[PDB]
């Protein structure tokens, strides 16, 4: 996150870290055996990391649990990032508490102008490499599809939404992907893409999870 602030130890308990030997993506605990990330974040032998704050020091609230199964959306388009949703199944069952809590699935789609919370361990400078060990957060509204449509012409599909500032300085960045975009206490987005980080007229692109609740619900219930 660029232009954000440090959340604070477990201020974001549904936030999960994906490690294949190094953190490469974020995710979301939607329940106790299941995690939602972005489909573009798929790899082999993934370790889910729960109750994380300093991702470089064992602080004591962490639960490191390897995946037993990973399912990418059937209509996931690596060329257009359309349907950028993946569901990850924990080998175990995580322990839900103070700092380890799941996120609520959306029942209606948040409208343009709703404030949400974005967060992660991705890059803090639009420029260069400078990766926090701490979990950084950001508050940005849901922009008009009209203005999301003007930023990135011809790339906004019906399963995406721009949240941010047309102005820049504040945005998600490389390492934030798969991470939660929460609004009014229900998960509405998945850090997908953008064109740089906190660049003007280049706000962040997210996955409209509200379009996927049935798939999730369905899938979680059969596997």
């Amino acid at each position: 996150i660029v232009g954000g602030y440090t959340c604070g130890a477990n201020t974001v308990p549904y936030q999960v870290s994906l490690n294949s030997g190094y953190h490469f993506c974020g995710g979301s605990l939607i329940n106790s055996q299941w995690v939602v990330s972005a489909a573009h974040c798929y790899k082999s032998g993934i370790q889910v990391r729960l109750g994380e704050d300093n991702i470089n020091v064992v602080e004591g609230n962490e639960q490191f649990i390897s995946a037993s199964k990973s399912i990418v959306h059937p209509s996931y388009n690596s060329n257009t990032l359309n349907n950028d949703i993946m569901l990850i199944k924990l080998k175990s069952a995580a322990s839900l508490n103070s700092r380890v809590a799941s996120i609520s699935l959306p029942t209606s789609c948040a409208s343009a102008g709703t404030q949400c919370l974005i967060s992660g361990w991705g890059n803090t400078k639009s420029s260069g490499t400078s990766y926090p060990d701490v979990l950084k957060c950001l508050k940005a509204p849901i922009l008009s599809d009209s203005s999301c449509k003007s930023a990135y012409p011809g790339q906004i599909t019906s399963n995406m939404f721009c949240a941010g500032y047309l102005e820049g300085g504040k945005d998600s960045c490389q390492g934030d992907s798969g991470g939660p975009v929460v609004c009014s206490g229900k998960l509405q987005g998945i850090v997908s893409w953008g064109s740089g980080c906190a660049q003007k007229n280049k706000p962040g692109v997210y996955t409209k999870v509200c379009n996927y609740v049935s798939w999730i619900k369905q899938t979680i219930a059969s596997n």
């Binding site: 573009h40 997908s192 064109s195 980080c197 962040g204």
Partner: protein, 36 residues
């Protein structure tokens, strides 16, 4: 010049580590190379 115009002024990447980047244009990484 708008957005510093096209010529590989469409390297829309993902926010994964490392990302996957695709250029738009028409005629780790990418970005500048070219223009005209």
């Amino acid at each position: 010049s708008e957005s510093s115009k096209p010529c590989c002024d469409q390297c829309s990447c993902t926010k994964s580590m490392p990302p996957k980047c695709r250029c738009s244009d028409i005629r780790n990484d990418f970005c500048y190379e070219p223009c005209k």
